[PDB]
């Protein structure tokens, strides 16, 4: 079976992720990347609801699950599930960046 990293996962820095999203909005507005200084992950998004805004979120590995660090934390079993949650919670506004 195939169990890769989500399609929007890139081994890029916070700055690189930010630049990728600005340069090609047509390809999506959400990137999953390695978390700086940790084995955890980060999600960088570019939303254009009112004005363009770049936002970063922490996704922590906890046991065999991942906890998205939000006001009310959400815990899911894998990274595909985390991407599904970001899309669902933003009602489709977030779309994985497919380079």
């Amino acid at each position: 079976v195939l169990n890769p990293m989500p399609a929007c996962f890139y081994t890029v820095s916070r700055k690189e992720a930010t630049e990728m999203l600005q340069k090609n909005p047509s390809l999506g507005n959400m990137i999953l990347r390695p978390g700086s200084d940790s084995r955890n992950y980060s999600i960088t998004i570019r939303q254009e609801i009112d004005i363009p805004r770049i936002k970063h979120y922490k996704v922590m590995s906890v046991g065999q699950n991942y906890t998205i660090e939000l006001e009310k934390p959400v815990t899911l079993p894998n990274l595909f599930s985390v991407i599904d949650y970001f899309v669902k919670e933003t009602r489709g506004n977030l779309r994985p960046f497919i380079a």
Binding site: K58, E89, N93
Partner: peptide
């Protein structure tokens, strides 16, 4: 580095 803890939807 700072992070958001609120996801925004329309």
């Amino acid at each position: 580095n700072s992070y958001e803890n609120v996801l925004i939807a329309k």
